[PDB]
Amino acid sequence: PVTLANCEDEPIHVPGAIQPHGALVTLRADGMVLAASENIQALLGFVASPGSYLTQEQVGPEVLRMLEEGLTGNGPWSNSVETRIGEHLFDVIGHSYKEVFYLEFEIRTADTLSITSFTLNAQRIIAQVQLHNDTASLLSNVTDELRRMTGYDRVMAYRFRHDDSGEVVAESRREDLESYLGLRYPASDIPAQARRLYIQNPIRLIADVAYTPMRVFPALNPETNESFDLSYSVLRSVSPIHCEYLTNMGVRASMSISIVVGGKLWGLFSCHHMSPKLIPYPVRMSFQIFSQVCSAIVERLEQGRIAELLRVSTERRLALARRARDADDLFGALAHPDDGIAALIPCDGALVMLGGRTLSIRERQAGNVLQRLQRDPERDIYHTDNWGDCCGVLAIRFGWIFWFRHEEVHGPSGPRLTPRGSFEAWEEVVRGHSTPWSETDLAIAEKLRLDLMELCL
């Protein structure tokens, strides 16, 4: 069973069920049917039964021809074919994962997207990514152009803070709906297994939210005695908790393109529709390549950005060092608000201490803290939240230095699952918390301390 307590540990990769807008058949390396969704018969007029092998006369030669090239293939398999089965024309998408072949039958409802038309989609959307040299212009723009394309009546962009928390930094919607810019959720709104997934799968599609799931039997793969891993499965089934959530938002359909930097989910575009919605495989696949592109483009942008700040910052220290080391008045050099140490780490208030002379730039909380490290008289460095009147406190020893950050920063069934609700349970974790001390800010205070360890007079 799934509650607000079993939220973060839910194995959403191995649900043993799929959404109903298609059907699943799984097979072992030799083509034998190991399991299938319970709707096959309804959808397709086969009754795939374990031990069976599919035959032209239920699945068409186009499928088997396909699957064969999968069975006699060497690497990770992925492919698909647009066959017509008895009742309907189909998008049948296969792929092998672990040691299992999945055949997912998703219902095609269109004409054929020319191998060309497909391209101008991809190219039309990539085009947006390459106009801009600013990371936020980028998101703002593509966020628009995606809507013009899909028709999804809400499409947003999310950025993910280092704490894996989440913020809505771009949006385009149908006016009727409430706006979302600036909204913040917790890391806890997207579990490590969903996040892990979104990293693996560029694109996730929820066809209908209140869908009533369709199960695969056996729920467990006899060959392996483990359940079936449906990551990389298209009709894989969505966690109920997240289904409740979307409904509490008044949403019926979904889709998300991923953005990935490092090996991490840097953020994602999320598509919402007030009614059910289904983007075809082929289109999704224009977006899959979009995502690859987008992520790259965003990665090099961001490495350049921080590379820069990182430079502007270190050039500062080094400047400050020659200035102090080459003057005799260090108190006057070290505390000039422009040659100010405050210039070095991003803070609200700072402090130079050496001898019996102090200066509170931007003094009392300092009587206490030099009293805290009294039980630690061999520390040359100090750092903390959530703590007088300022919570951020970083302290380096040479004679001391201090940097501060105060933190003025900024129906249904379950307790938390809503927009303004996840932000209500976001806040209570962040009032103890000043803007956390960047991996860069410990390196700055550190280099600086050492740097002044140098001055002999």
Ligand X SMILES: C=CC1=C(C)/C(=C\c2[nH]c(/C=C3N=C(/C=C4\NC(=O)C(C)=C4C=C)C(C)=C\3CCC(=O)O)c(CCC(=O)O)c2C)NC1=O
Binding residues for a tetrapyrrole, by number, are: 7
Q: Does 260 bind a copy of itself (CB under 8 A)?
A: no
194 binds, among a copy of itself, ligand X, none (CB under 5 to 8 A by kind): ligand X
Q: How many CA atoms lie within 13 A of 12 on its CB side?
A: 25
* CB-based contacts of 118, cutoff 8 Å, min separation 6: 282, 285, 286
User: Of all helices (H) and strands (E), which one includes residue 304?
Assistant: helix 281-325
370 binds, among a copy of itself, ligand X, none (CB under 5 to 8 A by kind): none
Shortest distance in whole angstroms from residue 41 CB to a copy of itself = 27
Shortest distance in whole angstroms from residue 58 CB to a copy of itself = 21
Angle between helices 439-453 and 281-325 (to 10 degrees): 20
CB count within 10 Å of CB 305 equals 13
Shortest distance in whole angstroms from residue 166 CB to ligand X = 6
Q: Which residue has the tokens 């069976």?
A: 52
- Integer Cα distance of 306 and 364 in angstroms: 35
Q: Does 300 bind a copy of itself (CB under 8 A)?
A: yes
Shortest distance in whole angstroms from residue 67 CB to a copy of itself = 13
Q: Per-residue string for binding with a copy of itself, 151-190, x by CB under 8 A? A: ----------------------------------------
For a copy of itself, which is the closer residue by CB, 85 or 138?
138
190 binds, among a copy of itself, ligand X, none (CB under 5 to 8 A by kind): ligand X
Rg for the chain, CA atoms, rounded: 28
| C-alpha to C-alpha distances, 117 to 143, 238, 306, nearest whole angstrom | 21, 31, 38
CA dihedral 252, 420, 160, 308 (to 10 degrees): 130
Shortest distance in whole angstroms from residue 119 CB to a copy of itself = 5
Evaluated on CA atoms 423, 425, 431, 435, the torsion sign reads negative
* C-beta of residue 34 within 8 angstroms of C-beta of residue 100: yes
390 binds, among a copy of itself, ligand X, none (CB under 5 to 8 A by kind): none
130 binds, among ligand X, a copy of itself, none (CB under 5 to 8 A by kind): a copy of itself
In what side-by-side order are the strands of the sheet with 33-37? 17-18, 214-217, 33-37, 22-27, 100-107, 90-97, 78-81
116 binds, among ligand X, a copy of itself, none (CB under 5 to 8 A by kind): a copy of itself
Shortest distance in whole angstroms from residue 239 CB to ligand X = 4
* Residue 267 bridge partners (DSSP): 159, 259
| C-alpha to C-alpha distances, 285 to 106, 231, 234, 257, 297, nearest whole angstrom | 14, 16, 12, 11, 18
Which residue ranges are tagged as binding site? 7
Note the residues at the interface with ligand X (CB under 6 A).
Answer: 7-8, 12, 180, 183, 185, 188-191, 194, 204, 238-239, 241-242, 245, 254, 256, 270, 417, 419, 422-423
Q: Does 109 bind a copy of itself (CB under 8 A)?
A: no
Q: How many residues bind a copy of itself (CB under 8 A)?
A: 34
Q: Which residues contribute to the site for a copy of itself (CB under 8 A)?
A: 78-81, 93, 113-120, 122-123, 126-127, 129-130, 133, 281-282, 285, 288-289, 292-293, 296-297, 299-301, 303-304
